[PDB]
Design a protein around this ligand. Structure first.
Ligand code: NDP
Ligand code: NDP
Lengths: 518, 68, 135
């Protein structure tokens, strides 16, 4: 229901955007509960210390998993934006929900009169148990617009000072009518805001401050303003106001069950996932989290350098874009003519602006000295991590019109280049962990009139097989027809990159991929 | 990244007379209209068309994945 | 400075502010204009902006306001000074203190004044009605 890009901050990760809070151990073994823009549901997280509280002694790590997001948003909404003062009467929607409970806890501490809207009778009873200060006249129905009349009755018709609205459509309009003179309306939802629904300005004749609250802004900007909310949450924790919510603990192996349980919408409190059990020790100063079985997907370090021969070509640019998304920050792209088109210039400038240390070169891998120069440049950037070989020269024609010169030209970029790269990589590339060369289905199946292409591709496969036998990385991928950049319909670039992600992890040597016509 | 479709436009102004005035013939027989996008001011101008306040929302892929 | 002026009878201040502010906008806006110009002013708010409305025409007529602006942390304020005369004196003392502090600190300067005698009250009303007065 929500596009991943809607999350603030240009992530582009295309995955791992499913978490917001956690409670675990710091690198020193300290018990900490944190707040992260994304990538929360994981066995580890990389968070700045400005988003990490300390779990007190009473709390258990299970309880601490609920406080951060809910209490941060409640505090930022009320204290820092609504400037709530003691004695006021504020309306908080969806009391059972986490933010509702946090807001109720904050308000009652100051002394306010609280109106809450719940969904059923069980939630009403639970909230009565939690907060004895709430009377029977402090509840309404949240599934209809009848809370308007209730609040307008028990308030004498004067309304309320604050409205922590989280409902949409007609119910939002009803909440606005409950406001009082000098009122303050705090919108934490994102549906009516997104749809650009109209809001009658007549309400402002009465002094009204219609706020729009998005806590997600702080995570990526406005670091100066954050420390106010952090100080407020810490003060609440030490003073006793901030109380952990109810939790329903699921295990890591059953996360889908937790998601479905949430989707049913029958949870009162918070739903939590137990990635790893808490030890009885106060400070375990452990080494690593327990290992688990996870689907494999490729990533790259930052100190490694990567080389793409013929990277300025069609497939080369898309593969380079893919690699950058996986952490590559030092690249070498080889072409005989360098940059000569607009698309190449656009891509290289974009990557340089992103921070990557791109560097085009004219070191023709066909000549062994050129291969040594290329590897030397890559080293100058940093240790050579991987080498890709996407060079090709095409001189097609039936064997009748073929000549030895055409064979030599077609096989120089691919046959000779791969050999030179292999020799140099063995000589002076000890940290290399990828060696990929791109072949064509013609090598296996045989496409009429591409004999030299077949011979060049077939050689590249033997070198890769031999490398993998001696314990070294090696892989020859046999592609069909790449579409965006035989009886095999072309292939989209996205599908090709997904298949490549699959291939780099397999233990085999030569793998192929194509799409069957009809 | 991904395909984005228009959802709202704050204002569009069209003036065919000024449009015909703006057009200038290329060396080939084809006629061309220069365009400028000012992402700061949220205005796109080309010939006699002036689009302002264009809003595009990400659209989930149809995931037909016809290619397997 | 010379780059800090625009035109108040046209919707062109939108482009001027956006260009000179780098396309970000203005953090705080004090608006006293009509419908089209109010909308123009709203499009000038930056993230974490604030909109101070002192006019009445749009508020009285209940013109629609798009709620998409609040995706940013914009805060919309309806400022009416009359509320103090009827209640909230304890709050009015804060503004009183602000004005007194400004006066004693020299920030508060008197405006340029045009004087009409008591017998000529009608002429004063006519002159202000024309709209050429400054001060
Ligand atoms: N300003 C911001 O950017 C932030 C936004 N928020 C918003 O605050 C609100 C509270 O979030 P959270 O604490 O997670 O609340 P929960 O998801 O735990 O509960 C929300 C409430 O909505 C009602 N509801 C009915 N059906 C469902 C359902 N299927 N799933 C969820 N709720 C349901 C219930 O209240 P009822 O009993 O009345 O039916 C429920 O308690 C959300 O709208 C959230 O988007 C939160 C933090 C930051
Ligand atoms: N995409 C496809 O349809 C399929 C292609 N393949 C293989 O996968 C790769 C895909 O790249 P592709 O789209 O063909 O690229 P291009 O069609 O753009 O051509 C190859 C690229 O490598 C460069 N190159 C060619 N020869 C040399 C050389 N001797 N030294 C340095 N750079 C060189 C070219 O630039 P310049 O000309 O300036 O040197 C160009 O950028 C190729 O290796 C191809 O053989 C196989 C199966 C399917």
């Amino acid at each position: 229901k929500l596009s991943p890009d809607a999350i603030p901050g240009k992530w582009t990760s295309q995955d791992s955007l499913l978490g917001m809070e956690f409670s675990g151990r710091d690198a020193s073994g300290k018990r900490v509960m944190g707040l992260v823009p994304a990538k929360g549901l994981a066995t580890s997280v990389l968070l700045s210390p400005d988003f990490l509280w300390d779990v007190p002694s009473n709390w258990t790590l299970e309880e601490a998993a609920s406080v951060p997001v809910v209490y941060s948003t409640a505090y930022y909404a009320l204290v820092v934006r609504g400037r709530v003062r003691p004695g006021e009467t504020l309306l908080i929607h969806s009391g059972s929900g986490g933010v509702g409970q946090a807001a109720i806890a904050i308000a009652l501490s100051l002394g306010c009169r609280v109106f809450t809207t719940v969904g059923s009778a069980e939630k009403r009873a639970y909230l009565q148990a939690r907060f004895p200060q709430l009377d029977s006249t402090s509840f309404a129905n949240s599934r209809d617009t009848s809370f308007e009349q209730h609040v307008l009755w028990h308030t004498g018709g004067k309304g309320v000072d604050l409205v922590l609205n989280s409902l949409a459509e007609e119910k939002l309009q009803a909440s606005v009518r409950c406001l009082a003179t000098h009122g303050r309306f705090l919108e934490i939802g994102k549906f009516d805001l997104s749809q650009n629904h109209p809001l009658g300005m007549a309400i402002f004749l009465k002094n009204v401050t219609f706020h729009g609250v998005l806590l997600d802004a702080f995570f990526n900007e406005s670091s100066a303003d954050w420390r106010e909310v952090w100080a407020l949450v810490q003060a609440g924790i030490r003073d006793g106001v901030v109380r952990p919510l109810k939790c329903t603990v699921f295990h890591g192996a059953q996360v889908e069950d937790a998601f479905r349980y949430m989707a049913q919408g029958k949870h009162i409190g918070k739903v939590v996932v137990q990635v790893l059990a808490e030890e009885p020790e106060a400070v375990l100063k452990g080494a690593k989290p327990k290992l688990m079985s996870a689907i494999s997907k490729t990533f790259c370090p930052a100190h490694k350098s990567y080389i793409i021969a013929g990277g300025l070509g069609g497939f080369g640019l898309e593969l380079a874009q893919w690699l950058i998304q996986r952490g590559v920050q030092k690249l070498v792209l080889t072409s005989r003519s360098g940059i000569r088109t607009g698309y190449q210039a656009k891509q290289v400038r974009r990557w340089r602006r992103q921070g990557v240390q791109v560097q085009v070169s004219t070191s023709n891998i066909s000549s062994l000295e050129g291969a040594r120069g290329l590897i030397a440049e890559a080293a100058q950037l940093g240790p050579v991590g991987g080498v890709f070989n996407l060079a090709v020269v095409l001189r097609d024609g039936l064997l009748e019109n073929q000549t030895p010169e055409f064979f030599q030209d077609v096989c120089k970029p691919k046959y000779s280049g791969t050999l030179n790269l292999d020799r140099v990589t063995r000589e002076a590339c000890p940290e290399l962990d990828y060696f990929v060369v791109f072949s064509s289905v013609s090598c296996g199946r045989g496409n009429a009139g591409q004999s030299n292409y077949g011979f060049a591709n077939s050689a590249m496969e033997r070198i890769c097989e031999k490398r993998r036998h001696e314990g070294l990385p090696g892989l020859a991928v046999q592609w069909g027809a790449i579409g965006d950049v035989s009886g095999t319909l072309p292939q989209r670039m996205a599908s090709c990159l997904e298949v490549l992600d699959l291939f780099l992890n397999q233990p085999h040597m030569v793998l192929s991929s194509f799409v069957l016509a009809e | 990244h991904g395909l984005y479709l228009p959802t709202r436009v704050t204002a569009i102004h069209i003036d065919p007379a000024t449009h015909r005035q703006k057009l200038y013939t290329l060396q080939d027989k084809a006629q061309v209209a220069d365009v400028v996008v000012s992402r700061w001011l949220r205005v796109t101008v080309a010939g006699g068309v002036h689009i302002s306040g264009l809003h595009t929302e990400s659209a989930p892929r149809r995931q037909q994945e016809q290619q397997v």
